[PDB]
Design a binder for this molecule. Sequence first.
Ligand SMILES: CCCCCCCCCCCCCCCCCC(=O)OC[C@H](COP(=O)([O-])OCC(O)COP(=O)([O-])OC[C@@H](COC(=O)CCCCCCCCCCCCCCCCC)OC(=O)CCCCCCCCCCCCCCCCC)OC(=O)CCCCCCCCCCCCCCCCC
Ligand SMILES: CCCCCCCCCCCCCCCCCC(=O)OC[C@H](COP(=O)([O-])OCC(O)COP(=O)([O-])OC[C@@H](COC(=O)CCCCCCCCCCCCCCCCC)OC(=O)CCCCCCCCCCCCCCCCC)OC(=O)CCCCCCCCCCCCCCCCC
Ligand SMILES: CCCCCCCCCCCCCCCCCC(=O)OC[C@H](COP(=O)([O-])OCC(O)COP(=O)([O-])OC[C@@H](COC(=O)CCCCCCCCCCCCCCCCC)OC(=O)CCCCCCCCCCCCCCCCC)OC(=O)CCCCCCCCCCCCCCCCC
Ligand SMILES: CCCCCCCCCCCCCCCCCC(=O)OC[C@H](COP(=O)([O-])OCC(O)COP(=O)([O-])OC[C@@H](COC(=O)CCCCCCCCCCCCCCCCC)OC(=O)CCCCCCCCCCCCCCCCC)OC(=O)CCCCCCCCCCCCCCCCC
Ligand SMILES: CCCCCCCCCCCCCCCCCC(=O)OC[C@H](COP(=O)([O-])OCC(O)COP(=O)([O-])OC[C@@H](COC(=O)CCCCCCCCCCCCCCCCC)OC(=O)CCCCCCCCCCCCCCCCC)OC(=O)CCCCCCCCCCCCCCCCC
Ligand SMILES: CCCCCCCCCCCCCCCCCC(=O)OC[C@H](COP(=O)([O-])OCC[N+](C)(C)C)OC(=O)CCCCCCCCCCCCCCCCC
Ligand SMILES: CCCCCCCC/C=C/CCCCCCCC(=O)OC[C@H](COP(=O)(O)OCCN)OC(=O)CCCCCCC/C=C/CCCCCCCC
Ligand SMILES: CCCCCCCCCCCCO[C@@H]1O[C@H](CO)[C@@H](O[C@H]2O[C@H](CO)[C@@H](O)[C@H](O)[C@H]2O)[C@H](O)[C@H]1O
Lengths: 103, 135, 105, 231, 80, 383, 53, 62, 168, 85
Amino acid sequence: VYTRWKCDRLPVFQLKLFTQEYPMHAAVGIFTIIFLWKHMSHCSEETERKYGWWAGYPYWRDPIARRNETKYKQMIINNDVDITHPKWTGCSVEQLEELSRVV
Amino acid sequence: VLFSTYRSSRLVSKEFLHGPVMRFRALGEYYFQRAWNGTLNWALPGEYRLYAVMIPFIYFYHRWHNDHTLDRDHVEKAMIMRWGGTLEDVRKLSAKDQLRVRCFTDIEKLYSAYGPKDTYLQPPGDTLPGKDFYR
Amino acid sequence: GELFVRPKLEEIPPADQCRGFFGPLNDSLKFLRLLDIKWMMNRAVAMRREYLIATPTLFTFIWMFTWKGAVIYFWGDRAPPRRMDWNTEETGRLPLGFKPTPAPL
Amino acid sequence: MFLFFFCDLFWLRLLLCMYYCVWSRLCFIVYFNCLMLIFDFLLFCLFDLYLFVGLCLFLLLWFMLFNLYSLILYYCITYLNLYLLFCIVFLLYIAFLFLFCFLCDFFLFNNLLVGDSFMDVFFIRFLLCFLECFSLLCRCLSTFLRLFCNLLSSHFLLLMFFDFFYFIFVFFFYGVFCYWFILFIFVFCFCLLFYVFLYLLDLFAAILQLFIFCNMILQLIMDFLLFLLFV
Amino acid sequence: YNMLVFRDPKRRPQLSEEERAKVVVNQAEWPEEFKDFDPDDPYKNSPEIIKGMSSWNLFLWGVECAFIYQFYELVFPKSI
Amino acid sequence: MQGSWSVLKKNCSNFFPGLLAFAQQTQEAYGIWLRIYNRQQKYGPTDFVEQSETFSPDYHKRFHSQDKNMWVDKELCTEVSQKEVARLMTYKLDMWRMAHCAGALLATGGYAIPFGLFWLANDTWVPSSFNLTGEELRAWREAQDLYRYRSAPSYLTDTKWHFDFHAYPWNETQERAWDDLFEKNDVRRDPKVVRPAAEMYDGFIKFELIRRKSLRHLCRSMNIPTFPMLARLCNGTRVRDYWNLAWCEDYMVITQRLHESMTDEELYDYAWRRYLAPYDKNLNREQLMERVEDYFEFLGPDFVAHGKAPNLVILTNYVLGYYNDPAYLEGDISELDKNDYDHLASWGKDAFLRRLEFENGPLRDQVEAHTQRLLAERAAIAK
Amino acid sequence: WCPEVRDRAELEVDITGWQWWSPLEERRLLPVRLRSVNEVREIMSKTQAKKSA
Amino acid sequence: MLLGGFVPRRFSQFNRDPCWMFFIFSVGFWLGEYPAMMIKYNARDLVYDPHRYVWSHHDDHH
Amino acid sequence: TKYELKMQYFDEWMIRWRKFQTESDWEIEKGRQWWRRFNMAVSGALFCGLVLYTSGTATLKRQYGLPHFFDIGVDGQAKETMLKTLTSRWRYTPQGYGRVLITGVPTYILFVTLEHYRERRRMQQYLQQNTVFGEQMRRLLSTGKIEEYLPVNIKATLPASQQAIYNY
Amino acid sequence: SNPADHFRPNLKALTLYAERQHYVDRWLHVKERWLAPWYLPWWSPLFQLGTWYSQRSRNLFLVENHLSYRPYKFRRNDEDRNNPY
Ligand SMILES: CCCCCCCCCCCCCCCCCC(=O)OC[C@H](COP(=O)([O-])OCC(O)COP(=O)([O-])OC[C@@H](COC(=O)CCCCCCCCCCCCCCCCC)OC(=O)CCCCCCCCCCCCCCCCC)OC(=O)CCCCCCCCCCCCCCCCC
Ligand SMILES: CCCCCCCCCCCCCCCCCC(=O)OC[C@H](COP(=O)([O-])OCC(O)COP(=O)([O-])OC[C@@H](COC(=O)CCCCCCCCCCCCCCCCC)OC(=O)CCCCCCCCCCCCCCCCC)OC(=O)CCCCCCCCCCCCCCCCC
Ligand SMILES: CCCCCCCCCCCCCCCCCC(=O)OC[C@H](COP(=O)([O-])OCC(O)COP(=O)([O-])OC[C@@H](COC(=O)CCCCCCCCCCCCCCCCC)OC(=O)CCCCCCCCCCCCCCCCC)OC(=O)CCCCCCCCCCCCCCCCC
Ligand SMILES: CCCCCCCCCCCCCCCCCC(=O)OC[C@H](COP(=O)([O-])OCC(O)COP(=O)([O-])OC[C@@H](COC(=O)CCCCCCCCCCCCCCCCC)OC(=O)CCCCCCCCCCCCCCCCC)OC(=O)CCCCCCCCCCCCCCCCC
Ligand SMILES: CCCCCCCCCCCCCCCCCC(=O)OC[C@H](COP(=O)([O-])OCC(O)COP(=O)([O-])OC[C@@H](COC(=O)CCCCCCCCCCCCCCCCC)OC(=O)CCCCCCCCCCCCCCCCC)OC(=O)CCCCCCCCCCCCCCCCC
Ligand SMILES: CCCCCCCCCCCCCCCCCC(=O)OC[C@H](COP(=O)([O-])OCC[N+](C)(C)C)OC(=O)CCCCCCCCCCCCCCCCC
Ligand SMILES: CCCCCCCC/C=C/CCCCCCCC(=O)OC[C@H](COP(=O)(O)OCCN)OC(=O)CCCCCCC/C=C/CCCCCCCC
Ligand SMILES: CCCCCCCCCCCCO[C@@H]1O[C@H](CO)[C@@H](O[C@H]2O[C@H](CO)[C@@H](O)[C@H](O)[C@H]2O)[C@H](O)[C@H]1O
């Protein structure tokens, strides 16, 4: 005789279980997952340094700095960003050259 | 039409890997399928030998993982911080020196909160290097 | 606990018997029944419509314990500071001599 | 931020696969009250009062695979976080509560207005109603907090006692060969007794706390169930 | 008897005293493993799994494994 | 029934002719339903016309009441014939399924097309109008019967288990009726013996208190689409309407004895719409007449006298009992001569197993006597 | 080889009937047993008397 | 649930069952690791790290 | 036309660059919010009306019959008037899926249509703006892409104390 | 402290970072790609489900006029109570 658990395959039984057996529970679970990923899915660098490492943050190599450096280099190279633009520096290119000659 | 929703739509023959599967079931059933193996909510069996075998194995593999993957990080951090603050500085030492340092770290771990506090508190007048030695 | 049976039409006491905060709001004071919350509560209890008192409360709690709680916590406006940083209404306008692109046509 | 990690049940999953490829009877259940809600015959309920059995059994199994085996040294309770337990209890409790509320039967809440007509509605009955509607959410919070903190405290105590035992055993066993061997023997016997007592206490409390974690949910369900009599 | 928390199961008697007294015991038919059977030590004559492997031998094997685990680095240290 | 490419081709070929036939049937059925609705509104009882409210005693949830919200139009034969009623019922089923499909299409825009391909590959949910030949109609009926077989046992078991676990019959006659109600279709059930179960279940659960899961099972067994199920009062309304039409037709037939003059195929269809005669059984006219007369007898004299049918839940269980085939058993008895645990033979017996065999084997009495004597001697020595 | 028991158990579990005890049905069916010859004689005499009446 | 199974009467019987053989081996490991720690961590030649005051976990977590 | 797909990028950019939100854009958004509330109110009124019209005769009699909670006299008069108005003529009182469809589909259609046309209106308003947001909207509709950092590229107006960055 | 450190997951393998802007934009692109085709009318329930709630939330954000300051969600340092920047 027909029974959901014995005859249906696992994905079908899962859908039936969470749609016609525990639908409210599934709905609340999805709600909670969305909330968690919307408000509890960020970690600042200081937080990672304080608690994000098993034995502590190895300041002697600063892996966060290398990670950010790789990120920014990849972004600049791929997107063809002119980091010498006045908006990034706040001064004209000629002023930048003058400063370079000064320092 | 593309995929069947019924488990009866077999994908292999009934005799596929019959021998190995039977051996696996023989291993599973010999000790578990017994009257005195009455589980408590499927988690706690009634067979004493199951406890006797599994508890040591679980402890062994957990301890191996902890010693070779988890505590190693703390040990390496101590070695790096106490002997230059860089990995190359530690590697400048010999294997025997590293052994000495790691065994001192184990001493500290065993002492913990009941051991003498001179292992990390420098008594006044001590001639050994301070915290600003490498600074 | 036990099954609830709605009272019959004849088992419901008259409105005039209900009491308010101070006293019954009988003739010459009927229109005050709308404003007296305690009179309405007593009337609901007399008419066995107690849910009117309980349903709004519990739901409210739920609404606070589920959706408005976190909304207030994460996006609510805290107390304003003493020295307030008002907006000068100078930002946004296009600069002089700028040629904006034409609108769709 | 996305962290990739794994639960500490892989060996237990393997054992479950090995030992439960064939059927076996279950007769001992930590929380048996989820199967027998009605004790007086001829009483029946039109509400799905047996919906909690599957979740109860799965939760018992999961929490037993985690907590009971956590006594073994270095075993990790991967789910041990306050807010994660809050999420679990929120799911279960609020799901059942919304099941009752979606029924759209307001009379079901009549019992919230505690007391009788003879008590002041605004100043007595209504205040108590507010307090009880608060008590429901407090019951949810209490369930999750109790489950979290019992485990945390028990394991803290076990770790501290084990550290003390290791310290004295390693750095003071030589006293066996000395003239003060009797003191060390007394201390060692005391430590063994305490070790056994702590293990037994933790084993019993781990199962009792699951009894109570499931009992709170079943009590929530029972607080809104109405039974009809067969005629 | 008990071994820590493990208790040896005991079979409940099924025969009454009157019927029991009429039973004739013939140990000649019993297996060699179970002769002079004692409920307090039913496995006294049980054969060893490995001939010549005593319980103390296994205990010493475990002790030696622990000693190796603790002392191997003392003889063959390795660099970080 | 599982989807197939042949059925997919069949339905694709007949898609547009099927839609045209469905539209024509829609016009005809709208006319018939307009006549029936006008008659009900004009001559119906005040409670039925005003839709009197019946609330459950526990949670005060409204649902259709069999006595008040269902009415049998004894004089419907003047305006509407039996064949028209059967046509209306068949069109109601087809329109329900088509409405669900159209709602899905509207909801999901053009993304329902692959799901439409899945739909056309199976005859379970396609309208009867999609079959343009006898063989196609036979296959479609086979699919419907397969769905009924799949669904009915669950409904029957739900009802029986809930009642038997939460209540018991009052008297011996009710016990016999309850026991014989849920027998497999291989045996014939006497409606007179089984009727008191209707009153018993009315005492336990009426149609106004039917649970949503049981309603879903019943709708599955009646080939009524269930997704989206929604509130229990929608599919409940569908079931009420279908059974009200069926009861009107049954009263007409009983009064006019139409079934005797009804032809073989029409009689078989009439039984099928009552969930009494599966097509795969290849029943003859004698068996169909026997089952129809049993159904009429189960309805009882009170049905003709006052238009009051027995409890709808028990009636549905009784009719669907014909789809509760005996549990399958295939394989020669000689297969029982094999052994199931040969793979364990190589393992042998450990010390504990040997001890258990020794203590509980043929020598169990001797071992017990020896052990008891030894224990008694030791106890005496201790004292 | 006992299909009825299998099907009934599977269906009961699949419809949320987890419980494995049926005290009411057992109470109804517990005292059932085949009758003795004398009981059969008494029942046949009762039936004959009823038919004669 | 602790219902049944082989139960050695004394130490000498732990060799009558493979599972209990593994159990006694594990017990030997457990109990023998302690004397090893006593010998290793109370040795005469063991010396505290000269730089132990350079850094410690106490300052790190503080 | 599907304005939401175009407008989502613009809204996200405005949120990221909300500093350059002129009071005109703020008023536009407030008007959008007010119109959303109005659409909700009218849709709810329509849904309530459809529900009342299709309600069963017995249901209406129970709802708009005795007893009176307040018993002021106006309440009873209004309830009797509404009951007579509803029960005078014949009303189609379906149940189940039919009532669901009749009560919902009109409401859903009305709400969606109003909101879509208000979104189109807001798009037009932003197009007609002479601020940086309006220029960004026009550029988005022209090139099909959102140009981030536009305000600093074209040097949009800044407070007198924050023009140093533009000093180049 | 040391006892407290024993209550951490013991099988951490990898950590991946992603800015909210980037993956939000990617999700918006995916949603636009799947909701663009002509065979999905704007009045369909699916399209409204996809778009209306997001539009409402973004509009609520834009209309926001708070007298207090809300520090940037993704600052480098948010552990300092006396430095919102
Ligand atoms: C374009 C905008 C789209 C918006 C989004 C829509 C999204 C999809 C949602 C579904 C929409 C409907 C889909 C089409 C259904 C077919 C028509 C129909 O009702 O068939 C009758 C039939 C009624 O079922 P029933 O149980 O027999 O009814 C019991 C009543 O007692 C029955 O009463 P009775 O017993 O007295 O018998 C009466 C019977 C007597 O008649 C007959 O017997 C003759 C036959 C008549 C029906 C024929 C139906 C044919 C269906 C197939 C059509 C062809 C498909 C072809 C497909 C292939 C094409 C290539 O006649 C009726 O059935 C009449 C029913 C009442 C009318 C319902 C329609 C209301 C909406 C239309 C008006 C809209 C106005 C907008 C104004 C705007 C102002 C601003 O419909 C159904 O089967 C029910 C629908 C099943 C799917 C439900 C899915 C969930 C719906 C939730 C909606 C919630 C609100 C909306 C928001 C959603 C947000 C999530
Ligand atoms: C042109 C045509 C004419 C015009 C159009 C006309 C209208 C047509 C439309 C209407 C048609 C209606 C009738 C439909 C009937 C057929 C339904 C059906 O599906 O039957 C099962 C059907 C077979 O039917 P059958 O064989 O005839 O058996 C029928 C029996 O009677 C068995 O019957 P049963 O009852 O046992 O089956 C029922 C079963 C039906 O389900 C199934 O059977 C499952 C089907 C999927 C199984 C998938 C298994 C394989 C998974 C593979 C995974 C990937 C593998 C690796 C791939 C690598 C590729 C490189 O269960 C259910 O019904 C469960 C329903 C669940 C509802 C969920 C509702 C969620 C709501 C959310 C909560 C909302 C709460 C409120 C919130 C409010 C907030 C405000 O299943 C299939 O054919 C399976 C297809 C699998 C396809 C391949 C895998 C998926 C591929 C995905 C590609 C994605 C591409 C894009 C990716 C983009 C990435 C960025
Ligand atoms: C080991 C791992 C394996 C893999 C696992 C995968 C991961 C799974 C994890 C999570 C699993 C659990 C999730 C649970 C969620 C919560 C469910 C819940 O609360 O349900 C309560 C409740 C339970 O349902 P029920 O009515 O009590 O009965 C459910 C039983 O299953 C009814 O059973 P029954 O036996 O009574 O009926 C059987 C039969 C009876 O036959 C019939 O009923 C006749 C045929 C009916 C056809 C459908 C009619 C629909 C009419 C309109 C419905 C309203 C539309 C509203 C407007 C549209 C909103 C989108 O019905 C059917 O065969 C149904 C066929 C449905 C096939 C589709 C199932 C989903 C497969 C995946 C396709 C979509 C993939 C999207 C993602 C990928 C994109 C690339 O749900 C409802 O009330 C149903 C509301 C449905 C609204 C529409 C769907 C909204 C969700 C979003 C849709 C997005 C579409 C995207 C299209 C593509 C875009 C690119
Ligand atoms: C059956 C259910 C069973 C299961 C229940 C399960 C749940 C458990 C219960 C507890 C809840 C748990 C919470 C779970 C999470 C749920 C989601 C959530 O919390 O989201 C909140 C969240 C709140 O928004 P937010 O973002 O957090 O922040 C607020 C913002 O302002 C947002 O901005 P916005 O633009 O979205 O604005 C939304 C607006 C709400 O909606 C609006 O946009 C505007 C209002 C729409 C009105 C709808 C129609 C009203 C009825 C019309 C008439 C009908 C009868 C017709 C016949 C009449 C004949 C005369 O809300 C407001 O901000 C308040 C507006 C206040 C306007 C009135 C101003 C006051 C003066 C005028 C009234 C006083 C007059 C007396 C004067 C003195 C006389 C002496 O989202 C919403 O729910 C709002 C959006 C959706 C609104 C839908 C509007 C339709 C409502 C129809 C309800 C009808 C049934 C109720 C009564 C039933 C009686 C039997
Ligand atoms: C992608 C799409 C997204 C869609 C989202 C929208 C939601 C989903 C849409 C619909 C989904 C499909 C399924 C819906 C459920 C179907 C239920 C069902 O099967 O009913 C059968 C049932 C048919 O059975 P029947 O036998 O004919 O009659 C039922 C019996 O009476 C039954 O007899 P009974 O004995 O059970 O009698 C009791 C019955 C009596 O009720 C009825 O059955 C009558 C019909 C309902 C009346 C509702 C209105 C009551 C009066 C409201 C007054 C409000 C005044 C406010 C004034 C404010 C002034 C400032 O029930 C009640 O007593 C319940 C009363 C309602 C209580 C509401 C409590 C809400 C608490 C809110 C907490 C706080 C929220 C957050 C904070 C908000 C504020 C800041 O259907 C109906 O009667 C009506 C069904 C209506 C379906 C919903 C239509 C949806 C339209 C949507 C338009 C807007 C679309 C927006 C789209 C946005 C972009 C995507
Ligand atoms: C070191 C600091 C420690 C602090 C610890 C603080 C405690 C943290 C505890 C976390 C674990 C426990 C979590 C329990 C669950 C909490 C749930 C919660 O509060 O989340 C609320 C939050 C609130 O959402 P929100 O934050 O996006 O709110 C938006 C509000 N505005 C726009 C005004 C800012 O919900 C979610 O996160 C999920 C939202 C999506 C799912 C719901 C969609 C439907 C909404 C329906 C109503 C509105 C639309 C109209 C109707 C429908 C139309 C289709
Ligand atoms: C539906 C495809 C339409 C277009 C034609 C594409 C043909 C591509 C060539 C395929 C050659 C190999 C075919 C091997 C047999 C496949 C059998 C099959 O599909 O069975 C599904 C079977 C599971 O079946 P059950 O659910 O257990 O039960 C089935 C009974 N209802 O699935 C599998 O095991 C996977 C088999 C994968 C085979 C390869 C399929 C490739 C399909 C590609 C489609 C895209 C177009 C390809 C064009 C190629 C042009 C040269
Ligand atoms: C089916 C219904 C179809 C309706 C079609 C249009 C009907 C005719 C126009 C209705 C009135 C519109 O007039 C409307 O007035 C309100 C003020 O009261 C304005 O609203 C303005 O002031 C209110 C005051 O609270 C602010 O909240 C709002 O942000 C602001 O925009 C609207 O911007 C304007 O559009």
